[PDB]
Amino acid sequence: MSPGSVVVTGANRGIGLGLVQQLVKDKNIRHIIATARDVEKATELKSIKDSRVHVLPLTVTCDKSLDTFVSKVGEIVGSDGLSLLINNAGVLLSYGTNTEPNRAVIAEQLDVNTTSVVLLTQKLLPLLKNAASKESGDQLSVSRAAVITISSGLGSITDNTSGSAQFPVLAYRMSKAAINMFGRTLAVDLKDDNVLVVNFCPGWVEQSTAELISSFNKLDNSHNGRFFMRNLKPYEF
Amino acid sequence: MSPGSVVVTGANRGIGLGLVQQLVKDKNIRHIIATARDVEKATELKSIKDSRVHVLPLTVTCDKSLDTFVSKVGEIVGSDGLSLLINNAGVLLSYGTNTEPNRAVIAEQLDVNTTSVVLLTQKLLPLLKNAASKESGDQLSVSRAAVITISSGLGSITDNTSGSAQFPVLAYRMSKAAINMFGRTLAVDLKDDNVLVVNFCPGEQSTAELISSFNKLDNSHNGRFFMRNLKPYEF
Numbered sequence: 001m002s003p004g005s006v007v008v009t010g011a012n013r014g015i016g017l018g019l020v021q022q023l024v025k026d027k028n029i030r031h032i033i034a035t036a037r038d039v040e041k042a043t044e045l046k047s048i049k050d051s052r053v054h055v056l057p058l059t060v061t062c063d064k065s066l067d068t069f070v071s072k073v074g075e076i077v078g079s080d081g082l083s084l085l086i087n088n089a090g091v092l093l094s095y096g097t098n099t100e101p102n103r104a105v106i107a108e109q110l111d112v113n114t115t116s117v118v119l120l121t122q123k124l125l126p127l128l129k130n131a132a133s134k135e136s137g138d139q140l141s142v143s144r145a146a147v148i149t150i151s152s153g154l155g156s157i158t159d160n161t162s163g164s165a166q167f168p169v170l171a172y173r174m175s176k177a178a179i180n181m182f183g184r185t186l187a188v189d190l191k192d193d194n195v196l197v198v199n200f201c202p203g204w205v206e207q208s209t210a211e212l213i214s215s216f217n218k219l220d221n222s223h224n225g226r227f228f229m230r231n232l233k234p235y236e237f
Numbered sequence: 238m239s240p241g242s243v244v245v246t247g248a249n250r251g252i253g254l255g256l257v258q259q260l261v262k263d264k265n266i267r268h269i270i271a272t273a274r275d276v277e278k279a280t281e282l283k284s285i286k287d288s289r290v291h292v293l294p295l296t297v298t299c300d301k302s303l304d305t306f307v308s309k310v311g312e313i314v315g316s317d318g319l320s321l322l323i324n325n326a327g328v329l330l331s332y333g334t335n336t337e338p339n340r341a342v343i344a345e346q347l348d349v350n351t352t353s354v355v356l357l358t359q360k361l362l363p364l365l366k367n368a369a370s371k372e373s374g375d376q377l378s379v380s381r382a383a384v385i386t387i388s389s390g391l392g393s394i395t396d397n398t399s400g401s402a403q404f405p406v407l408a409y410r411m412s413k414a415a416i417n418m419f420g421r422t423l424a425v426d427l428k429d430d431n432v433l434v435v436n437f438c439p440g441e442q443s444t445a446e447l448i449s450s451f452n453k454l455d456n457s458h459n460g461r462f463f464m465r466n467l468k469p470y471e472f
Contacts (some may be wrong), residue, residue, distance in 0.1 A: 097426040106352040115343040157472040164427030174415035181414035186401030189334040237394040
C-alpha cells in the first residue's frame with residue numbers, strides 16, 4: 001500500500017525535488033505536499049504537472065510560516081490525516097573547530113537543522129496520530145503514518161573519524177546528531193500512537209532518491225527509531 | 238601526575254563545586270579556576286580559602302563575558318597554558334515531544350549546553366595547546382592537556398529507550414547528544430596538538446569518582462564517553 005498524503009520540505013531542488021518526482025510516479029498517493037521558502041522561484045518544482053502536487057511556501061525558521069503551512073496541509077488532507085512526513089529541509093553552514101568562534105553561525109545551524117525540524121514535526125503530530133488511527137492494529141509502515149528525517153552519515157558519532165578540521169562541518173554534525181536523537185526519542189514517545197519514525201542519510205542524483213523511496217516501502221516496526229543508509233543498512237548513532 | 242592548572246565552569250554548586258572541593262585536595266595543582274554567573278551569590282565557593290583558587294565571573298551565553306574570562310585565565314596561567322578544561326556549566330530546561338511547541342526553549346537548551354560550551358572551548362584552545370606542547374611525544378593525559386566535558390547518559394542515543402515519556406528531557410537529550418558529538422570531533426581535530434578530550438556522565442561520591450577516573454585517562458580514552466567509573470557508553 002501507498003501513503004495517502006505526503007509532505008516534503010525543501011522540494012525546490014536537491015533531494016527534496018527528486019523525492020517529489022519519485023513520489024509522483026506512485027499514482028495511488030492522493031496528496032503530495034511540496035514546500036519552498038521562495039515558491040515563486042521554485043520553477044523546476046512548479047513545472048511538475050499532475051494535479052495532486054501542492055507547492056506551498058514554508059520558512060522553517062518562522063513560526064508563523066509554520067502555523068500557516070500546518071493549517072493548509074490540514075485543510076488539504078482533511079479527516080484522512082497526514083500519512084508521511086519526510087523532513088528534508090535543512091542546510092550545511094560552514095563551521096569547524098578552527099573557525100573564528102561564532103555563536104550566530106552555530107545557532108543558525110541548529111535552528112535550521114534541529115529545532116525547526118522538531119517544531120514542524122510537533123505541529124504535524126495531531127495529523128499523524130490521525131492517519132495512524134485510521135487502521136486498527138499494531139504494525140508500523142510509511143503508508144500508515146511515518147516521520148522520516150533526512151539526516152547525514154556525518155551525524156553518526158561513533159563513525160566520526162574525520163572531525164571538522166579538513167571539512168568545516170562541526171556545527172552541522174551536531175545538528176544531525178541532535179536530530180538523530182530526536183528521531184530516537186520521537187519513536188519511543190509515539191509508541192502507543194503507532195506512528196513510525198526513521199532517519200536516513202542520502203548519498204553524497206535521482207539514484208539516491210530512487211533508492212530511498214524503495215527502502216521506504218520496506219519499513220516496519222523493526223526499523224523504528226533507527227538511523228540507516230539509503231540502501232538501509234543501519235548506522236550506529 | 239597532576240594538572241598545573243584547572244578550569245571548572247559553573248562551579249557555584251552541584252558537580253562543578255564538588256570537583257573544585259576534590260581538586261583543591263591535590264596539593265600539586267598550581268592554579269584552580271572556578272566560574273559562577275553571579276559571583277556574589279557563590280557563597281559556598283567563595284568560602285573556600287585557598288591561595289591558588291580563583292573565582293571568576295562568567296555567563297556562558299554572553300560572548301563578552303566569555304572573552305573577558307578567557308583573558309583572565311590566560312593572565313593567570315601565563316606561558317604554562319591551561320592544562321585542564323572541564324566543562325560543567327550547564328542546564329536542564331523542561332521540554333518533551335508532547336510539550337506545546339516552543340522555539341525559544343529548545344533554543345535556550347542548545348545554546349547553553351551545546352553552542353556555549355563549543356565557543357568556550359574554542360576560545361581556550363591556544364592555552365590548552367600551549368600546555369600540551371610543554372611535553373614531548375603523543376601521550377594524552379589530564380596532566381598534559383585535556384578537555385573534560387560533563388555530559389549525561391540521557392545524551393546516549395543508543396541507550397534512549399524512555400524518550401520524553403517519563404521526563405520531558407527532549408531538548409536536553411539533543412543538547413547532550415550534540416556535545417558528545419563535539420567531544421568526538423575535537424578529539425580528532427586536536428589529535429596532532431596532543432590534547433586529550435573525553436566526556437563523562439556525572440552519574441560528593443560522584444565527583445570523587447570522576448577525579449580518580451581522570452587520573453587513569455590515556456590515549457585509549459580519547460574521543461569517548463564514559464560513566465564515572467569509566468564504564469563506556471555507546472553514543
